[PDB]
Amino acid sequence: SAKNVTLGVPRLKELINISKKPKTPSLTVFLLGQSARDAERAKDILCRLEHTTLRKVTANTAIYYDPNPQSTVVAEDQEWVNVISPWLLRVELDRKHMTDRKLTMEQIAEKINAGFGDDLNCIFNDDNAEKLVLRIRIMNDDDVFLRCIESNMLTDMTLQGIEQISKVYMHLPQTDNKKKIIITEDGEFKALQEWILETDGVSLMRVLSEKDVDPVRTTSNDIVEIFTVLGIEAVRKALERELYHVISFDGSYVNYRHLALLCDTMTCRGHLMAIT
């Protein structure tokens, strides 16, 4: 599902000319334990990584002029039973993405309260009605301020997941090298087929610094990011792996002599000496 990995001559250019912005930066995140074994905990790790803004979960957004919060211009007995500005905000979410990413109105409201402080109060409907409503006021440049903060909060709020990683894939690998490999009590290799997950962005540091994520095997396919995170020697090995990947993808063979020499002369000065 994510074979836009841009192999061949473009990848050779992206490696030789060490580019800050590759066309397809991607992770190969591995999992530590029982999460690597079952799919549900793998999905739980997936949702904590996939970046999610509040646009992803809402159906539509509308603002009204309710003179009294007690009046409830919209017929909602939840606000009646729950209950200072007249200009309010109303957003409707959908159950689909809500239960796909396992959030709560309490979590969304506490995210809003942490991001914006006590400049606004969120009044959210309980997770019992068919409709998913939370109302927004402003506590005490009158309503266009609310319009602008609505736009800002929809654009970037990071309800779940981490930034710069837009979409993450999940699959069981078939190739033995990408599969986890162990040694049994009788000295076998016993190729294990555990869950892995690949991304389309790159952080390499907020990812490995996460619970149940294996910080021993997670490569990031990004030479500059590897230089920033792991250091020049890890850069040499990762660059060798990515440079051998494009050559051996065709099935052709190039002796390790030349790959080692290139990755050495490109990294013999302590910095990423792009060949330009």
Binding site: I16, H258, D264, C268, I275
Partner: protein
């Protein structure tokens, strides 16, 4: 790409110290291919004691 690769490595050579140094005697590898061996005289083999 080929010309750009060549112009970055055109002076890298194996000295009589058996090490690999560029034009300014900066050491790139202590042995060529980190083994000191020619690439045209090797073969594919299988490690029997492995697995």
């Amino acid at each position: 790409i080929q010309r750009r690769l060549i112009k970055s490595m055109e002076s890298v050579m194996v000295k009589y110290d058996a090490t690999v140094r560029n034009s300014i005697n900066q050491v790139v590898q202590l042995r060529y291919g980190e083994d000191g061996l020619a690439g045209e005289s090797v073969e594919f083999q299988n490690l029997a004691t492995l697995k």
